[PDB]
Amino acid sequence: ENLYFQSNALDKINRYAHGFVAVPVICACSEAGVFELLSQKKSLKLEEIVEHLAANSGHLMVAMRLLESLSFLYRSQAEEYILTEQSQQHQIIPKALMSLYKYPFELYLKGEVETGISNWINCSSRRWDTENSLLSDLLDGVLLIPLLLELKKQNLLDESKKIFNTLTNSLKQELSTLFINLGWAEEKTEGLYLTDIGRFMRDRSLNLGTTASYAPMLLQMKELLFGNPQRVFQRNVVASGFQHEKFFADTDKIIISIFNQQPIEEQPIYIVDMGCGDGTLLKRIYKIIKQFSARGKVLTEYPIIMVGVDYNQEALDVTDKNLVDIPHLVIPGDIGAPEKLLEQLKAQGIEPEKVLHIRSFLDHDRPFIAPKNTEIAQARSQLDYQVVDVDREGKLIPPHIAVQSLVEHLERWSSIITRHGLLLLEVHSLTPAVVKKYIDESESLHFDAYHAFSMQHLVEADVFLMAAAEVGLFSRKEAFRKYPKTLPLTRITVNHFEKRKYQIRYATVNDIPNLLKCATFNPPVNEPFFQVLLKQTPTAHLLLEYQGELVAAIFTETKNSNEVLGIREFLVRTSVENWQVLAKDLLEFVEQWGVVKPGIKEIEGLLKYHEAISNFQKSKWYQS
Ligand SMILES: Nc1ncnc2c1ncn2[C@@H]1O[C@H](CSCC[C@H](N)C(=O)O)[C@@H](O)[C@H]1O
């Protein structure tokens, strides 16, 4: 899809979805006095703004991260929010624009309400009286998402006969002016027709329905930020509405490769899908195995049994019927109760050693279970995670608590995973620093806000991989993929996790005594330098740990305005058996971790230190 359609169509729709979420957040903060407060106090931490405004810290934090990403707020290193030169743009947003989130567009297009949208069309033609091109697009999105969705639902952009000509003259004049102003239609000599851009708005699948369904919650943004969120939440795969489904083609390829492994008898027998839904992913994998893999030539001799697992009983039945001509079973289960799933499998003679676990876009939707390792959870408060996670009351869950929860969740899975591993797709959030640079290219701004508001559990891609590594789960380099492919940001990982005998975790001050005993490729580093290095970037330095032994550590730094990740130390404990393979594993992980680290465009040092350990032959290493 070419460059002209990228910037004049795709980017436009993405900005409209941005505005659809961002304009309600800005208005609710604007009306509550957030920018007035920050204009009086110069700078405030989240908990201070919460106190002054009696806010819900969780949802307000979502809002703060959105405002920072749009440059409406600056956030200092001490984590105080500060006004910016763009803050004052909140005054450009007409207060009454929020009424569109309850405007019956369906009745408007049928001529059944006299109150129309005529001044919002004129606002749009005046580009909302601002010179900020992006703001004009955020504001258009409030009108255009619901209107275009409704236009398409009533087939009013169909181009046989003419466009709009079945409407009343005033309705057809309003909409012709809007579509001409937008560049979506032009008056040719015989009539009015769509342009290439308007035809793109009509024909391409743009997730309009998904974005428009954010509306009932966005209507209640004031209640969510400053009132009672339990009033807001009163009374078959949404996440796979991205801009493509390349990741299922990747899953296809990974699957084929698993079931091309030789000899056949070492392949899995059961494919257990957590969150089976309507059996779609299972049916798709079974047909792929049949038509394209070696195993598909011998399904009579070596059966494959598809297993759908889901916590909703109705989903089991739709799955059980949709897989009627496929050897399958249907079992109730919950992600986050994998030990119960294993007890269930074993109660039907399914040996765990014969199982390949799969799931798509589900760990972020698990029921949150609070950390049970109280001590380990506390020790994690020294790290510096940016995770935003909201609880039943609208309060902010402390980032180390949210990550500890994730780690204990992956530890439960880690203990039932077998030699066949765990095929796992997941969606990930971004940091405000990165969303800032890629507002047009990435959906993060509205998606991360909407899903955090919804009390779901997104983390940054590198946090997710580190949480898996802490529990012995490693995304096989042969299968790994990240999207988007060509931007220094990661919204989707495609993973084939395997269980390994070691763990990789972040190094801490407590690791210094064993760091001091390591051989090292650069001049050895003393206690105080380790103290500084670790306190200033507590999530920059990784170690590989095996049965308690420090085997290796790598120290990194992020430079070139946060685009280049560089390696600055490599420590090995050469007394440890197989340290050379283990050190090379740690290095391979650092490469994957760097590929998904938000903002990182390239990595420096991977050839240098792989060579040093590859041909270690020369103890030109300090301390043996
Ligand atoms: N906690 C849970 N345990 C097991 N299955 C679950 C579950 N939560 C949702 N599901 C199932 O997972 C299926 C969809 S898989 C992913 C769907 C969606 N993108 C999401 O974020 O959840 C649904 O059919 C649903 O019934």
Three-class SS of 535-596: HHCCCCEEEEEECCEEEEEEEEEEECCCCEEEEEEEEECCCCCCHHHHHHHHHHHHHHHHHC
Which one-letter DSSP state was computed for residue 502? S
Buried b (16+ CB within 10 A) or exposed e, 322-337: bbeebebbbbbbebbb
DSSP state of 302: S
| Cα separation, 186 vs 170, whole angstroms | 18
Nearest Cα residue to atom 12 of ligand 1: 275
Ligand 1 centre distance from Cα of residue 457 (Å): 13
Closest to 492 measured CA to CA, from 443, 547, 558, 564? 443
- Give 426 Cα–ligand 1 centroid separation in angstroms: 12
Structure tokens at 254: 């990974």
The Cα–Cα gap between 198 and 208 comes to 15
CA 464-467-471 angle, to 5 degrees, is 140
- Of the candidates 365, 361, 595, which has an alpha carbon nearest to the alpha carbon of residue 480? 595
Type of residue numbered 152: K
Catalogue all structural domains in the chain, each as residue range(s) with its CATH number. Answer: 3-229 (no CATH), 504-614 (3.40.630.30)
* Side-chain-facing half-sphere of 35: CA atoms under 13 Å: 21
Q: Name the strand (E) or helix (H) holding 58.
A: helix 57-69
How many residues are there in the chain? Answer: 624
Angstrom CA distances, 53 to 24, 32, 40, stand at 17, 7, 14
Whose tokens are 């240098």? That residue is 608
Phi-psi region of 185 (alpha: psi -120 to 50; beta: other; left: phi over 0): beta
CA distances from 366 to 274, 363, 405 (A): 11, 5, 11
Which residue, 307, 249, 259, is CA-closest to 282?
Answer: 307
Among 310, 428, 492, the mutation site with the greatest number of ligand 1 atoms within 8 A of its Cβ is: 310
Cβ neighbours for 171, distance < 8 A, ≥ 6 positions apart:
108, 109, 111, 116, 164
Q: Which of 161, 157, 174 is nearest to 113 (CA)?
A: 174
Angle of CA points 33, 97, 54, to nearest 5°:
25
> Beta 519-520 vs 549-559: how paired, if at all?
unpaired
CA distances from 187 to 126, 163, 180 (A): 20, 11, 8
What is the rounded distance in angstroms from the CA atom of residue 565 to the CA atom of residue 42?
34
Strands 541-546 and 602-604: unpaired
Residues placed in the known binding site: 244, 310-311, 334-335, 360, 364, 451, 456
Q: What is the resolution of this structure in A?
A: 2.4
Q: Do residues 340 and 434 make contact, with C-beta atoms less than 8 angstroms apart?
A: no
Of the chain, the end-to-end C-alpha distance in Å amounts to: 56
- Alpha-carbon distance 128 to 432, whole Å? 26
Rounded Cα distance between 551 and 567, Å, is: 17
- Distance from C-alpha of 66 to C-alpha of 50, rounded to nearest angstrom: 16
**Can you name the residues that pair with 83 across neighbouring β-strands?**
73
Cross-strand partners of 297: none
Q: Are 434 and 68 in contact (CB under 8 A)?
A: no
312 C-beta closer than 6 A to ligand 1: yes
How far apart CA 155 and CA 165 sit, in angstroms, is 12
Question: Comparing C-alpha atoms, which of 233, 239, 235, 216 is closest to residue 56?
Answer: 233
Atom of ligand 1 nearest to the CA of 366: 1
Q: CB neighbours of 327 closer than 8 A, spacing ≥ 6? A: 303, 304, 305, 306
For the stretch 110-147, what's the b/e string if a residue is b when 16 or more beta carbons lie within 10 angstroms of its beta carbon? eeeeeeebeebbebbeebbeeeeebbbbbbbbbbbbbb
Residue 192 phi, psi dihedral angles, 5° rounding:
-100, 130
Residue pair 217/453 in contact by the 8 Å Cβ criterion:
yes
How far from chain centre, in Å, is Cα 221? 22
275: Cβ below 6 Å to ligand 1? yes
Residue 542's DSSP bridge partners are 506, 554
Q: How many CB atoms lie within 10 A of CB 340?
A: 14
Task: Give the integer Cα–Cα distance in Å for 420 and 337.
Answer: 20
Q: Is 298 in the pocket of ligand 1 (CB under 6 A)?
A: no
Cα of 173 from ligand 1 centre, angstroms: 45
* Residue 310 in contact with ligand 1 by CB distance below 6 A: yes
Backbone angles phi, psi at 534, to 5 degrees: -85, -35
Listed residue (79, 64, 60) closest to 385, CA to CA: 79
- Tokens matching residue 382: 């020294």
Query: Using what technique was this structure determined?
Result: X-ray
The bridge status of strand 422-427 relative to strand 492-499 is antiparallel
How many angstroms separate the Cα of 190 from the Cα of each of 187, 297, 557? Answer: 8, 60, 64
Which residue has 């008056």 as its token pair?
A: 187
Q: Please name the helix (run of DSSP H) or strand (run of DSSP E) that holds residue 64, with its range, or none.
A: helix 57-69
| Residue whose C-alpha is closest to residue 495's, from 363, 600, 388 | 363
